[PDB]
């Protein structure tokens, strides 16, 4: 568990190694290799603990990630649920939030087809 709460896949480039963290996509992997100044075409394995700590402090301090981000997410959902609005009601049941149609499809918010007799 080096950077941040999850150790990163060596042998694979860092601008994706940092995407292998919850809360940090490729544009955030973009801006953190120019702001702590490390070349993006070097692997996790070809680093020095300098590059490591610059990265770890920077990344971890600026935004919020991992469980805490999760924490706020579900909390956001929880409040949306608590009130409780339409946008949260559809978190209660398990049906689409963003105004969808469900008569067919919706098999991701709904999962395995419960075939009925």
């Amino acid at each position: 568990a080096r950077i941040a709460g999850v150790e990163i896949p060596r042998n694979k480039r860092v601008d994706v190694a940092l995407t292998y963290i919850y809360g940090i996509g490729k544009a955030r992997a973009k801006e953190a290799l120019e702001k702590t100044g490390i070349n993006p075409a070097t692997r996790v394995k070809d680093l020095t603990e300098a590059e490591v700590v610059r990265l770890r402090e920077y990344v971890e301090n600026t935004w919020k990630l991992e469980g805490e981000l999760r924490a706020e997410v579900a909390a956001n959902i929880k409040r949306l649920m608590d009130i409780g609005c339409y946008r949260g009601l559809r978190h209660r049941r398990g049906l689409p939030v963003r105004g969808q149609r469900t008569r067919t499809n919706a098999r991701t918010r709904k999962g395995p087809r419960k075939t009925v007799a």
Binding site: R79, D82, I83, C85, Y86, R87, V116
Partner: protein
Amino acid sequence: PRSLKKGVFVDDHLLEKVLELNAKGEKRLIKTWSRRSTIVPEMVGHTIAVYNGKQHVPVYITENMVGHKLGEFAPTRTYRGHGK
């Protein structure tokens, strides 16, 4: 969400009805139709009756509900479940 260029939206035939109570006498039953209205800071603590196509729904307002409309707190389709 709307364009911030404009000011947030409230029917003005309701916000007049939000403010007039704060200085006359709070409060009684406000029966609305404007489900489109953003929830104003001055509404908080009130009981308003959002229509759902047939029925005036009681919606008491808290400091955790404001950005959302008056329509989020009165669903119109009544579902229950399936196959029960």
